[PDB]
Design a protein around this ligand. Structure first.
Ligand code: ADP
Ligand code: MG
Lengths: 77, 76, 52
C-alpha cells in the first residue's frame, strides 16, 4: 500500500483488497492440489492480458473531453 | 444482483459488436443501479488501475511462493 | 578364532548415528525447495528480519 501511495498516489485501498482476494483464491486453488507454479503462471498471464485489454479497449482520451475531464477526475478522487 | 447486472451488461458489450457502449457501465452507489459512468463523469487515471494490478499480482505471487516458515526464537 | 574384538565402547556408534540423523534431518528439511516445482522458504530471525 505504501508503494502504491508513493508511485501513484491513489487506489491505495484497492490494491490491498485486490491482492488479498488474489491470495485467497490462489490458496483455494492450491488446496485442490493445483501446483503453485501453475497458479503463479496463470496470475502473470492474466495480469498481462488485463493490462493489454485495459490499454486497448477501456481507455478514454482526455483531449476529446477538455477541462471537464480534469474536474470529474478530481471529484471522483 | 448489482454485480450480476454489471456482468450481464459487460457480457452483452463483449459479445455484441453493436453494443460496445456498455463498457462504460459502472455502479451508481446512490441509487444502487448500473449507470454509464463515462457519461456520469466517474473517471480514474489508467495508470492507477494498471499499477494496482501489477503491484497486487506481484505481492500475491511473492506470498504464494512460500510453503514453510522458520521463526527463530529471539536471542534476548 | 570365533569372536573378534569385543568393541566394549558404544559411544562412537551413538555419535555416528546422531551425526547421520542430524544430516538426514537437514536434507529432508531442505528437500522441499528443490527443482522448478520447489517452493521458497520463509525465515524470520530473532531480531525480526524476514527473508524469503
Ligand atoms: N461517484 C462515484 N460513483 C461510483 N463509483 C465511484 C464514485 N467515486 C468513486 N468511485 C469508486 O469508488 C472506489 C473507491 O475509491 P477510493 O477508496 O476513494 O480510492 P482509494 O482506494 O485510493 O481510497 C474507486 O475505485 C472508484 O471507482
Ligand atoms: Mg482514492
Amino acid at each position: 500500500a505504501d508503494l502504491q501511495d508513493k508511485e501513484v498516489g491513489d487506489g491505495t485501498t484497492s490494491v490491498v483488497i485486490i491482492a488479498a482476494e488474489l491470495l485467497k483464491n490462489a490458496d483455494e486453488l492450491v488446496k485442490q492440489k493445483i501446483h503453485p507454479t501453475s497458479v503463479i503462471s496463470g496470475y502473470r498471464l492474466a495480469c498481462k492480458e488485463a493490462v493489454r485489454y485495459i490499454n486497448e479497449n477501456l481507455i478514454v482520451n482526455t483531449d476529446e473531453l477538455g477541462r471537464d475531464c480534469l474536474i470529474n477526475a478530481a471529484k471522483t478522487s | 444482483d448489482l454485480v450480476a447486472k454489471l456482468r450481464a451488461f459487460h457480457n452483452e458489450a463483449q459479445v455484441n459488436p453493436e453494443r460496445k457502449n456498455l463498457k462504460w457501465i459502472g455502479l451508481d452507489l446512490s441509487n444502487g443501479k448500473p449507470r454509464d459512468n463515462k457519461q456520469a463523469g466517474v473517471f480514474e487515471p489508467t495508470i492507477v488501475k494498471v499499477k494496482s494490478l501489477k503491484f497486487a499480482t506481484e505481492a500475491a505471487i511473492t506470498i504464494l511462493r512460500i510453503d514453510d516458515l522458520i521463526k527463530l526464537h529471539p536471542e534476548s | 578364532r570365533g569372536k573378534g574384538a569385543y568393541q566394549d565402547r558404544d559411544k562412537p556408534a551413538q555419535i555416528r548415528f546422531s551425526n547421520i540423523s542430524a544430516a538426514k534431518a537437514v536434507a529432508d528439511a531442505i528437500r522441499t525447495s528443490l527443482g522448478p516445482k520447489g517452493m521458497d522458504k520463509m525465515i524470520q530471525d530473532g531480531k525480526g528480519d524476514v527473508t524469503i
